[PDB]
C-alpha cells in the first residue's frame, strides 16, 4: 500500500518509519549495549567488534522476521535470534553476549525512542521553515484588507496578513511545546524482565548511565515499560500541530470557492485545492489515531498486552500523517495567489452594511448617540429596500450629509480605515516567532 | 512496513488491500463501463475489446502512479490517464471512449466496493468458521464447572461451555447483521461529474443499468458521493465484532493468569517450551485480540467524523476514508485469524479450575445452602444460621463444608450425603447447559 | 448544568433520560420480577401489591441514592435497599420478596433498555416526521437549478431537490436499520449474580419468560451482562443519523454564505442571519464520534461482569440519545422552514460565465461537426470567453463554425442550466418512491 | 441527572462547572470590562458600579436564559440582555455602556479561561496530595517484595514500592507539565466582532491591558477566537492524568482478584465480596476521557473568525473531562491513602511457580561457579525435573551433585529467596521520591 503514500506522508519521514528504520533502532540498542557493558566489564572487547559489525538493518530478512513475529509476540525475540545467528557465522562465542540483561520491550521502546528523535529533528526544522516563510507573508499583507466572515456571514473588515498571523501564533505555540517535552520524550528504557535490572547484579547503573550515553539518551528516573505518559504526550502535540494545520488548510479551501476566489493554492506544479485536501485530511484522521495512544495507557503491572500491541502502528502512522500536512502546507504558505482586487469586490456585496459600526461611532459624536442610532438604521433599511449602497443612501440623508462632507463619508465607508488593530496582531505575532529563533 | 503485518493481518485480506487490488477494482469498473456502454451504442464493440486488455493491475507502475496521484489529488485520474497511454499503444482510436461519463469518485467508490464485496466474503466465511469451533467447545464443555468471576471476583459458579456459548451468541449476532447489510452496501457508484450524469444524456439509465449488472452490484436509488453512511455501516459492523473478539481475548488471557491457569492458547503447557513454566507461557495470540479491540474504535470514529461532507463532493474529509477503511478490514482479519487458531486448539485443565472453585472454601456456595436450609428451618432462622457458619469458617479459617457439619442444627436437618451435594458446585450450575443449548440451536438455525 | 440543554436536546427525550426516567426504569423491573415470580408461586399476591405500590420513582430521594451509589459501586443496591424499607413501612412482610433472584445488573440493564425503547420509539416518530417534510420539499424543488459544487468548485447543474433527495435517501436507510435492530435490541436482561440463574433453581425459565412477557420485551438465548454489541448496536445507528444530518447541517451552512446566499434556515438587523440550527446539526456530527467510540472501547467486558469498562457506558448511551433528539428537532425546523432564492441560484450559476457548461455544448457540436474538430473550436472558445472575460455564450455566437452549425435559438438552449440537469428529476422520484414504499 | 454525579464527579469541580458557575464566569468579564474601559475614559464610573452589582450569578434565571439561547446561537447575548435590563431597573443610563466592544466568544472564552484557572487550581493541589501520599507508600513498601507480572504471567520479583513509584514518576511529569501550560492557557479572550477590536479605536490595547490586568491573566499576541490549542492542551494533559491513574486502577483491581489478594481497596465505611468501587471509577474515566478528548481534537479546525458547530462542539465538552478527572483524583486518593497490603500472600503466590521464576538468579552464580556452559544444561535439568516431578527447585537443587557440591544449603537458601534479587528496586524508589521532593519548589 503505496499509491497515497506519496500525497499524504513526506518521504524523509516514511525513511525513519520503514521496516529498515524499525530494525536499525533495535540494532543499534544491541551495539550500544554490548559497548555499555562492555566497560562495565561484563562483556569482552573483541564481542563488542563482532556485535557491531552485526548491528545493520541490511543484513536481515524482513519477510522471514514477519512470520517469526506472529509466533513470538514481539519483534525483538526473534531480531535478537537473528542476530545471534550472524554473529555465530564469524566470531561463534561472541554470541552469549547478545542483549545481555535486558528485555525484549528494553531494545523495542528505546529503538522507537530513536525513531522518534529523528522524527522530531525534522519536525522542528519544517515548523521553523514554515513559520518563517509564514512570516513573511503576514508582513506582507499585514494591511490588505478582506471582508471578516463569522458563521461564514460577512462581518467588519480583518487583514490577510492578521489571518495568516494567526497560524502563525499557533506554530510558534507548538514549537514552544516540542522544546518543552523533547527532555522528557528523549529517556532511555532500560529494565529487564520486569523492570528490577536484577540480571545485571550491581553493574547495574553503571551499564545504564554507560548506555544512556552512548545513545546520546537522558537515563530516567525509573523504567517505563508501562507507564506510556511520555509516548502518549508527543502524539498528542502532533495532534495539536494536525488542528492548527487543519484550520489552514478550511480557510485556504474556503477562500478559493467559486463565489469567494480570495486566495489560492499554487498552481499544479477548475483549481482543485489538492494541497488543503491533505491538511484537512490529517486532521480529520489524527484525533482517532491520538484517542488510541490515550486509550491503550492502562497497561497492567510490569508489561500489558494488547494495550501495549496498539501503539506499534499508531504512533507511526500519527508522525507519517503530520509529515505529510507539514509538507503540503508549506508549499501553499510559500506560493499562495492572492487577489486584493476580488477581496476589496468582495467586502461591499453587502453594500457597506458591514460598516455601518464605522459610521455609527463617528455619528455618535457629531449628532446624538441616541439621534444617530435612528438616524443610520433608518440609512440601513433603506439602503436595503431601495437597494443600493449606504455610501449613497448616507450622502441623500440631510442630517448625515450636513454633517459629514463628501470627503468624510467617502473615508468611514473606506474598509482600509477600519482595520482596528490588525496590523498590531501581525506584529506581534511576527516579533515572538523572532524571539523565539533565540 | 510489514514487520508487523503477519502476525496483525490476515493474508488474504491484506491481498485484497494492497495496491493492486485497489488498482485492479478501478480497471475492473473501466473494463465495465465500456462494456456497458457499447451495449447502448455509445461505444464501439471493437473499442471494449482494446480497453479490457488494458484493464490489468499488473500492466501499471504504481510508484509512478503515486507521484502522479499527489499532484492530482486523487487515484482515478492518473490511472485512468496511464490506461489511455496504454490502449493507445494498440488501438490509438479506442482512447477516447475510455472512462466516457464517468467521474473521477465514481472509478474510486465503485472499485472500492467490489473490495469490500470480496472482504465481506472473506469475513463471513471465516465467521461461519469460527462460529462452528466455538459452538462444538460450547458442547464439549457444557457442564465442566469453573467459579464465576465478577468484578474479578469469585461470584456462584459458572460452566466454560457458558462462557464460550456467549462469545458464540454475539458471534451469530453479526453474521446476522452482515446479512442484512450485504443489500444495502453493494451498491454501483456511477453519478459522473456532480452526480447528475448529464453527459450521458437519454442513455444515462440504461448504462446504468447495464453497469450494475455488468458488476453484479445493485443499483442504488441515486448515486451517493457525499452521502457515506453505507460504508460507516460496515465498518461499524466490524467495529462490533472487533470488540466481541476482544472480550474473548480478554478471558483468555485473565485465564492464562498464573494465578488462575485454566485455559491456556495453543501451542504446548501454555505456549511453546513449557520448560520454566513461570512465564514463557505468553497468549500471543491474545495480544492480537486485544489489540485490534483497542485499535479499531478510533478507526471508526474517523469514518464517522467524515460524514458532513459538503455538497457534491468533499475535499479532506472523502481523503480521510481512504486508507481508514482498509485498516479496519485487515485488523479485523487479523483477529479473526488468530481467534480462530486460539478457539479450536486451547488447552482446559478443569482439576486446575474445580481447585480454583473452593479458594474461598465454599463462602461462593453458601447462597445454595441458604435456599435449601430456608425450607428445613426458618428462613429467618436459618439466615442468623448461616451467616454464624461463615462468620465462623473463616474466623477458625477452615472450608464451610466442615463447619456446617459441626453444627447442631443444620447437622440434624441435613445429611453427610445431603451437605456433600449442597457444597458441590457442580450441582449450582442453574441453567449454564440451557444457554448453551440455546446460543448453539440459534448457530443452526442461522445456518439455512 | 442545562443552560445548553434546551438548545441541544429534545425536551421529551431529556425526559426519559433524566433522574426519574433511570429510576423508573429499574423500578418497572422490580414490580414487573414480582408479578412474574408470584405467578411462578414464588411470591404471595399480597406482597405484588404491596411492591407495586412502591415502584414509583417520585417516592424516592436522588440526592440520598446518589450519595449511597458512590459507596455501592453502582444504583440498583442502594435503590432496592431504599424501596424495600418503603415496602417495610407498609407491607413488613413484603420486603423479603423484593429483587428476588436477580443481580443489580439485570435492574439496571433492563431498566436501561425499557428507557431505550421510549427513546426508539421518538427517534422513528421524529424520523418518519422528518422523512415526509423533506421528501415533500424534495419533489416541490425537484427541478429548480443551483451550480454544482465539486472540492467547492463549481461543477454542473443541480437541483434543490436532488440534494434534498439524497438526505431523504439517508434517512430511509437509517429507519430501516432501526426496523432490523429493534426485535435486537428490546431484549430483557435476567440472569442473577453470574448469569446462570441458579438461585431460583428450576422455576428460572418460567418466571423469565414471565417476566419478558410483563415487561412485552423478548427472552434473549441467554443473558448478556459482558455481551455488549446490542446497546453498541444501537448507538452506532444513532451515529449514522447524526452524521448524515451533519451533512444536512453543513449544506445548508454553506448555502447561507454571504458569497452565496441561495438558501437560509427560518427566521441593524439586516444582512445579519446566523444558521444558529445548522450549528447544532454540525455539533451533534462532531461530538458522537467520539461518544460512539467509547461504547466500542467498553466492549472487551471480562467474564461475567466488569468493572470500569461497563461504569463508561452508564453517562455515554444517554448522551448520544440526547445529542440526537436535539439534532433531529432542528432538523426538523430549518427542513420545513428553509427559505429559496431560486433568483440568486441562477446568478451564481454563470459566475464563471457559462464554462460550467462547456459539457453541454462540447456533446452537441461533437455530432454536428467533428468530435475532434469540436474539441478544437471549443477549447478556442472557452480560452478566448476568459481573456477577452465576457460569457461564453457570447463567444459560441461570434464562433462562425459555431453559429454556422448552430441557431441563435440553439445556443440559447445549450448555455441554459435548466436544460442540463441529467437525471435530477429521476433521483427525487426514486428517492420519494422509497419513502412511500418503506411507510408500510 | 445526579444520580452517578457523586460517584463519578468531585463536588468542588461540579460546583465550579455548573450553570451558576458559568454565568459568574461571563458576569465577571463583563464588570472587568466596565472598570477597564472607565479607566480608559470610555465609561462614567457611574455606570462601573451600577454595572458590577448587577454582575452576580444569582440574580439571574437559568430557566430563562436556557430557552432564549435555544434562539440566539451562544449564552452571552442572552446574559448580556437580562444584564441590560437588570441595570436599567437602577440606574437607566448605565445600560447602554455593558459589554462595550466586545463580542459574544469574548465574553464566553473569557469566563471559560476563569472557570479553567479555579479548575486548574484544585488538579494541582489534590495532584500535590496524592503525589505526597503516594511518595510515603512507595517508600514505606519499597521493599516488600511480590512477583513481577508480564503479559499476566509470573516473572522476576518486584517491589509494591516499585510499583507505586511509577504512578508517582508519572503523576510529576504531570504537574511539570501543568505547570508550563500555566501561562500559556491562563490568557484573556478579546477581539470583538472579528477580532480587529475596531469599535474601540485608538483605546483599543489601553482597554486591552487594563482588561487582562483587571482579572489577572496575561494579554496573548492576538486575540483567539478559532486558534483553539490551548484549551485543547489542557484537555489533553488531563488526558493523561486519567490514563495514569488508570493505569493504577486497573493494578488494583488485578491485586484484589481472588486469585491475587495481594492489596486491596480500603474497607470503606459473602466469600469476602469485596468489590473495588473505587477502581471502577479510575477504569472508567480512562476509558471515556479519550473520546472527549478526541472530540476537542476534531473541533480544532474552525474556519475563518468564528466557526459554528465545532466551536458549539467544545462547549460540553470541556467541562466534561475536567469533572471526569476530578472524580478520578478524588477515588484515587481513597485508595492510595489507604490501601490494605498483605505481605504474606505476596509471599506465598511468589513461589507459585515453586522457585522457576528464580531460576535465572541460580543461573547467573552457577554460571561462574561451574562452567556457563555446564551450568546452562545442569539447570534446565533441575528446572525439567522440579515440574515431571512437580517439586520446588530448591529441593530438585539440593538432590544435585553437582550443584549442592559447588553451593552450601545455606546458598541455595540465599539464592532462592526473592528478597534477594529486588535488583533495582529500591533506587527507582529512590529516585522517584527524590525527584518528586525536587519538584516541590
Redesign the interface.
Known sequence: ????????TAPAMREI???RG??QGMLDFEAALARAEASAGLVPHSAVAAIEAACQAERYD??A???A?????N?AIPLVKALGKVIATGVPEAE?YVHLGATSQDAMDTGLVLQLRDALDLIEADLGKLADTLSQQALKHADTPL????????????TLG??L???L??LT??R??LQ?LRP?LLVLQFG??????????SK??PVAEALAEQLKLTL?????H?????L??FA?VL??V???L??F???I??L?????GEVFEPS???????G??????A??????????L??????????????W??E???L?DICCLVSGALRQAQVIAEGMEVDAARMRR?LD??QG??L???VS?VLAQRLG?DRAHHL??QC??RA?AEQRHLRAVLGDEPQVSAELSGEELDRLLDPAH?????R??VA??V??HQRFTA
Open positions: 500500500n503505496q499509491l497515497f503514500d506519496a500525497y499524504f518509519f520503514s521496516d524499525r530494525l524482513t519477510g522476521l514477519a512470520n513475529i506472529a509466533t513470538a509476540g519483534s552469549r471582508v471578516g466572515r463569522t458563521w461564514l456571514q460577512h462581518a467588519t473588515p480583518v492578521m489571518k498571523a494567526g497560524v501564533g499557533a505555540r507548538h514552544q511545546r518543552e522528557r529487564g524482565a520486569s523492570g528490577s535490572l536484577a540480571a545485571l547484579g547495574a547503573m530516567p528516573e525509573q523504567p517505563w508501562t507507564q506510556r505518559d511520555r502518549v504526550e498528542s495532534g495539536l494536525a488542528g492548527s487543519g484550520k488548510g478550511r480557510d479551501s474556503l478559493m470557492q467559486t463565489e469567494a499544479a506544479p477548475k483549481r482543485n485545492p489538492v488543503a485536501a491533505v491538511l484537512i485530511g486532521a480529520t484522521r489524527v484525533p482517532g489515531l491520538l484517542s488510541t490515550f486509550a491503550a495507557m492502562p497497561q497492567e503491572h510490569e508489561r500489558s498486552l494488547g494495550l500491541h496498539a506499534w502502528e499508531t507511526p468582495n456585496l453587502t452594511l458591514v455601518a459600526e464605522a461611532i448617540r443610520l438604521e440601513c433599511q436595503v477600519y482595520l482596528g488593530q490588525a498590531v496582531w506581534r505575532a516579533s515572538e
